[PDB]
Design a protein around this ligand. Structure first.
Ligand SMILES: [Mg+2]
Ligand SMILES: [Mg+2]
Ligand SMILES: [Mg+2]
Ligand SMILES: [Mg+2]
Ligand SMILES: [Mg+2]
Ligand SMILES: [Mg+2]
Ligand SMILES: [Mg+2]
Ligand SMILES: [Mg+2]
Ligand SMILES: [Mg+2]
Ligand SMILES: [Mg+2]
Ligand SMILES: [Mg+2]
Ligand SMILES: [Mg+2]
Ligand SMILES: [Mg+2]
Ligand SMILES: [Mg+2]
Ligand SMILES: [Mg+2]
Ligand SMILES: [Mg+2]
Ligand SMILES: [Mg+2]
Ligand SMILES: [Mg+2]
Ligand SMILES: [Mg+2]
Ligand SMILES: [Mg+2]
Ligand SMILES: [Mg+2]
Ligand SMILES: [Mg+2]
Ligand SMILES: [Mg+2]
Ligand SMILES: [Mg+2]
Ligand SMILES: [Mg+2]
Ligand SMILES: [Mg+2]
Ligand SMILES: [Mg+2]
Ligand SMILES: [Mg+2]
Ligand SMILES: [Mg+2]
Ligand SMILES: [Mg+2]
Ligand SMILES: [Mg+2]
Ligand SMILES: [Mg+2]
Ligand SMILES: [Mg+2]
Ligand SMILES: [Zn+2]
Ligand SMILES: [Zn+2]
Lengths: 134, 57, 178, 71, 48, 116
RNA sequence: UUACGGCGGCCACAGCGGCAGGGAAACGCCCGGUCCCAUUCCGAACCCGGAAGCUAAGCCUGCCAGCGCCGAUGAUACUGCCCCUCCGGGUGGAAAAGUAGGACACCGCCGAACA
RNA sequence: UGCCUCCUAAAAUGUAACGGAGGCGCCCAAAGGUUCCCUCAACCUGGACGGCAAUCAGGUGGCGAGUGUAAAUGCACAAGGGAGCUUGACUGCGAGACUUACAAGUCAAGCAGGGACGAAAGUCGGGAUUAGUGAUCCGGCACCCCCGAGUGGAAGGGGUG
RNA sequence: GUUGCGUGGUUCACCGCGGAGGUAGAGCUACUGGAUGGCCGAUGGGUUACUGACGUCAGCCAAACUCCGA
């Protein structure tokens, strides 16, 4: 996942503070992954988790990814001193706050759905839990 | 602005070949204007393969 | 004292009232203005419209038309903003009545292969538009004294509120539909 | 990168209730972020100076923020 | 392309104002009716 | 309708730079097809201090046409203003163009005492 | 005092839209282009002269929450200063969004009719 | 490497980095002054060549267009579009302010002369605003006739542009 | 900073009153961009089982977004 355009190529780091206020409830499916701590979730990790969910359920069901990695992060070349201009973008990041719902899942069977979401959670650099649409 | 801008515009006379005659004021044509067809004579204002085979044979 | 105007005021005003149940005489439709423009294209090319359009629209109508200039620029037409591209005149009043008469009576029938103007070319509010292609049927111009031929299109603006009302008004005025 | 222009020190110089003399500069601005009211002239570079002594008074004048001076 | 020009009073020849113009858009000397401090009134001025 | 809106626009546009006060009130005119109206406004408290119109004995004191009637009502307003104690005003076109009936009114008001 | 024409305050709680109703004076459309004046062409507009017609439109009155607008209380986000290792807590402020709901304006001066 | 605009910049002003983005070293004799008038872009429908888009007509459209040129703040009341006349893109000043180590930089009501436009009220000391620039020295040019190495001149200097 | 001569509460703290804001937060059919899932589906694609314009219904994001706003 990569945005097609960005208005600003190099940006400040997104701020890691506060509880999430939007997208904190399951809205598209029956089961979801809710974040319990701040972190920078990468498109690599997102694709890893999506593939884990799909290969566990193997068929049927629908998976929603309601975050997008559009905030870029830069990096200087390897062996360089400090301060000769900002580096070029090299990561794409979603800014995740506690309470945010990361993935959503619909599937008939409780146990398989929960196992698939646990598969996904073990790929993310966050403590997360599984929640349901009541 | 009307000083020397618009062309002449004075009474004329339309006469048609059929005979329908009226008069308005037109441009440079000095007096009478003679026309061949008008709204009072022109058409549209006044109104088989097997058949051909058999009429041939 | 335009005969088409008196025929209108004498029969058309109450014929239209009989047709559409106008409870007020102010509601009766009428033609307010007639607009003619050439819409020349040789703006970037040869830059001549001073006589190609002005010196004959004067002859067709009776008043000098206005020269229109492009509002923006288009590369696919070599059009650059601010240069003469169209010539328009606005007939209104007894001159408009006389032009309508002179058109419908002796000009419009003279069109070669004329079979009747379409009745579907109304705008949707009551205003009618149609086009020509040459310095023909207007007897005022002479083909012996013209450059390249060019057409025009005419807008007949009416106070009618609907296309059927406008069509009835023009049919009464003498526009041959089909 | 690396370039910038000088800070132009714009903004409001006299707030509501202050007693000014004639000729006081009230607002340095670009454009009419504020508009001149009574006894307030604009100025060549949109400066909103005072034409009379009195107290500055801000208000609304049908969409425009205006500065006036009460005698 | 836009040189500095000076305008002199027609009557007293005093060089009263200096300004700029485009030599191509205005290939000829300007005439303006400026105020002449010497003559004390408005007079015609011209380039030098 | 379009005429009303356009006249209002023109009136506001001229009104941007002309107020009228106690010592120098505003002279507003309102010209219809049949009559003409005028009043002095003093736009600090919105208080008319004198007013004349073409619905008076003026309606029959007619030496001719609408311009003559406007001359008469101008003579009336000048005297009413002097009676009220005013002698200098600012003329308000009202969005119309200065000339014809309005210019006749304004001139009559000028030679009959008002200084504007 | 009532109810119509103007000039302002104010600038959507006033706006947009929808449905009905009105012509005493007035405001309007309206009839003409000799006169002042006018159209990058047009008496359409601006101006001038009138009074055959009409409230159809403008304008005015009444009723509609449809679109738009306003909008609390409470809670929350955030936060000043303290306590406190953080986690958190005390004390002082306090949103935006959403909800209940409001709302098809109000006021001043002049003129006419009525008084 | 100087100047202008934005963000960083923590809701007055100010604030660093070899932090993030851009412009400038001009143009306009009208693109200045004034008086008067107008409202755009986009979309829909109809219309000869003509098409997604030239000109026309009618709807809808409160600013999404435009502004000489970057950005920001403005501007529909228009600072945006059109037209008539003009040279204030003045001379002598300037109370009072902003900014500021200093040197600089910026605004200014109003008075007088002589004018432009306007029926008047009034506006006009360049341009919607903020960049388009260089101290002092030493010289050049025009004007005033201030000094003139014994006197009268002159040279030379002085003043104002 | 200190010290001489002037000035004398002008400084500072607290309370009350009069003011300008666009940060934190939030919100976005209020703009410029990003962007998830439905529905309608322009074209492009081979009768369209592929692409998915513009719309529209829900959920979201932004130092250089702002109808707001401590
Ligand atoms: Mg949010
Ligand atoms: Mg984990
Ligand atoms: Mg700055
Ligand atoms: Mg030239
Ligand atoms: Mg009546
Ligand atoms: Mg007429
Ligand atoms: Mg009516
Ligand atoms: Mg009615
Ligand atoms: Mg509350
Ligand atoms: Mg709220
Ligand atoms: Mg309402
Ligand atoms: Mg800042
Ligand atoms: Mg600041
Ligand atoms: Mg601060
Ligand atoms: Mg550069
Ligand atoms: Mg300009
Ligand atoms: Mg303009
Ligand atoms: Mg001009
Ligand atoms: Mg100059
Ligand atoms: Mg000074
Ligand atoms: Mg003077
Ligand atoms: Mg001045
Ligand atoms: Mg300037
Ligand atoms: Mg500029
Ligand atoms: Mg030296
Ligand atoms: Mg000597
Ligand atoms: Mg000498
Ligand atoms: Mg001097
Ligand atoms: Mg505050
Ligand atoms: Mg900001
Ligand atoms: Mg934030
Ligand atoms: Mg948005
Ligand atoms: Mg923000
Ligand atoms: Zn015939
Ligand atoms: Zn001289």
């Amino acid at each position: 996942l990569i945005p097609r355009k960005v208005k600003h190529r190099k940006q400040h780091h997104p701020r890691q503070r506060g509880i999430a206020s939007g997208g904190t409830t399951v809205n598209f499916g029956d089961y979801g992954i809710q974040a319990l701590e701040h972190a920078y979730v990468t498109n690599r990790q997102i694709e890893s988790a999506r593939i884990a969910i799909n290969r566990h359920i193997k068929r049927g069901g629908k998976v929603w990814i309601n975050i997008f990695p559009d905030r870029p992060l830069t990096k200087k070349p390897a062996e360089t001193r400090m301060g000769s201009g900002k580096g070029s973008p090299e990561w794409w990041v979603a800014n995740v706050k506690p309470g945010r719902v990361l993935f959503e899942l619909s599937y008939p069977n409780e146990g398989v759905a929960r196992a698939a979401l646990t598969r996904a959670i073990h790929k993310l650099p966050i403590k997360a839990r599984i929640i349901t649409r009541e | 602005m009307k000083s020397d801008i618009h062309p002449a515009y004075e009474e004329t006379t339309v006469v048609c070949g059929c005979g329908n005659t009226f008069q308005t004021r037109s441009t440079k044509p000095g007096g009478r204007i003679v026309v061949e067809v008008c709204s009072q004579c022109h058409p549209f204002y006044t109104g088989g393969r097997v058949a051909r085979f058999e009429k041939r044979y | 004292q335009p005969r088409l105007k008196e025929r209108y005021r004498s029969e058309i005003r109450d014929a239209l009232r009989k047709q559409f149940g106008y409870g007020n005489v102010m509601q009766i439709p009428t033609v307010t203005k007639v607009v003619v423009n050439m819409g020349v294209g040789e703006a970037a090319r040869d830059a001549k419209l001073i006589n190609g359009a002005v010196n004959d629209l004067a002859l067709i109508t009776g008043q000098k038309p206005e020269v229109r200039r492009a509002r923006k620029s288009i590369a696919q037409f070599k059009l650059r903003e601010g240069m003469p591209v169209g010539v328009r005149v606005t007939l209104r009043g007894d001159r408009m009545w006389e032009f309508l008469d002179r058109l419908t009576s002796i000009a419009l029938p003279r069109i070669r292969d004329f079979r009747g103007l379409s009745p579907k070319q109304f705008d949707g509010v009551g205003n009618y538009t149609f086009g020509l292609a040459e310095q023909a049927v207007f007897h005022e111009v002479d083909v012996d004294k013209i450059d390249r031929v060019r057409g025009m299109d005419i807008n007949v603006v009416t106070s009618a509120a609907t296309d059927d009302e406008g069509r009835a008004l023009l049919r009464a005025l003498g526009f041959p539909f089909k | 990168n690396g370039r910038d222009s000088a800070a132009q020190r714009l903004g409001v110089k006299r707030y509501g209730g202050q007693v000014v003399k004639a000729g006081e500069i009230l607002v340095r601005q670009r454009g009419t972020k504020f508009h001149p009211g009574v006894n307030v002239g604009r100025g060549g570079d949109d400066t909103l100076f005072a034409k009379t002594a009195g107290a500055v008074e801000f208000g609304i004048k049908r969409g425009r923020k205006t500065v006036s001076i009460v005698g | 392309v836009r040189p500095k020009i000076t305008l002199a009073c027609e009557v007293c020849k005093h060089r009263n104002y200096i300004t700029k113009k485009n030599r191509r858009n205005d290939p000829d000397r300007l005439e303006l009716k400026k105020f002449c401090p010497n003559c004390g009134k408005h007079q015609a001025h011209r380039e030098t | 309708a379009t005429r009303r809106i356009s006249r209002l626009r023109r009136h506001t546009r001229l009104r941007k730079k002309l107020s009228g006060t106690a010592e120098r009130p505003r002279l507003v005119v309102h010209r219809s097809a049949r009559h003409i109206h005028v009043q002095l406004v003093n736009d600090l408290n919105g208080t008319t201090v004198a007013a004349a119109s073409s619905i008076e004995a003026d309606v029959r004191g007619v030496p001719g046409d609408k311009k003559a009637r406007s001359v008469r009502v101008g003579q009336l307003i000048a005297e009413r203003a002097k009676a009220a104690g005013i002698d200098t005003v600012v003329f308000d076109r009202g969005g119309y163009t200065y000339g014809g009936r309005i210019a006749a009114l304004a001139d009559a008001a000028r030679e009959n005492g008002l200084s504007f």
